[PDB]
Write a protein that binds this ligand. Structure first.
Ligand code: ZN
Ligand code: ZN
Lengths: 152, 152
């Protein structure tokens, strides 16, 4: 049972905490609980780095060990870091649970030490018209992020 | 891979960072993220010099090794620095990527050590009919800038 936790920092409204859980090499479970977001859909990703020296900007692109194109968590075409959209409710609040099989807490593909980033806009899932669709799903700015710290 | 990074200063509350990237001698990709700006279109150019002894003002006109008049980035008649407009959203942030062929990161025409400047108003693109359309795109007003430094 490995465990991680990202405490979200933001310059805009955004607060919250995101817990990760992995038993053996079963899937990782990410349970998130967040506030200060515009109702609707927001991109949610594991970026490649946890360099926070320029805030969320310095955390690099989506965690992509497999060198693949951007997709939804449900695609075979997909970054590892692609957790899709989280649905923000009317009160600015999201409270979700995602189970994924590409964001391990242990080993050489570990996301421990990396950042999760919530985005201003919906993730395209690689399918919008846009120039950035197949690399970022064109989700706009990095509105909150925290480094995935090892938890006890 | 050549890399560049400009950190914005302003006396007007604009903040941001702008990244540049160029594989070998393909186009340069510029990815920026900026805050503290009036919503709507702002002209966005690479300027000739990286001289900030008098602020944004000492950075010269638009970067222009070919000696052309001002245009849109998609025109033949175009300064090298003619990067068009960025769109600032209702929160006063802009998050954007521009791919361009005339702003290299290496060689004689390299933009490294030059400045990138955000302007108060929209760029004309040379089509506004103003006496300054063919020079500044009537965007006029330097509201933040940053010298393009070498990145790791
Ligand atoms: Zn992705
Ligand atoms: Zn120009």
């Amino acid at each position: 049972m490995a465990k991680g936790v990202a405490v979200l920092s933001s310059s805009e409204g955004v607060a919250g905490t995101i817990l990760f859980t992995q038993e053996g090499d079963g899937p990782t479970t990410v349970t998130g609980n967040i506030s200060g977001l515009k109702p609707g859909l927001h991109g949610f990703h594991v970026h490649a780095l946890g360099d926070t020296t320029n805030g969320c900007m310095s955390t690099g692109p989506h965690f992509n060990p497999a060198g693949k194109e951007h997709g939804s968590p449900e695609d075979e075409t997909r970054h590892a870091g692609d957790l899709g959209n989280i649905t923000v409710g009317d009160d600015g609040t999201a409270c979700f649970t995602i189970v994924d099989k590409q964001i391990p807490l242990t080993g050489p593909h570990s996301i421990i030490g990396r950042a999760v980033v919530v985005h201003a806009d919906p993730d395209d899932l690689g399918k919008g018209g846009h120039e950035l669709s197949k690399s970022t799903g064109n989700a706009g700015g990095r509105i909150a992020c925290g480094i995935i710290g090892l938890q006890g």
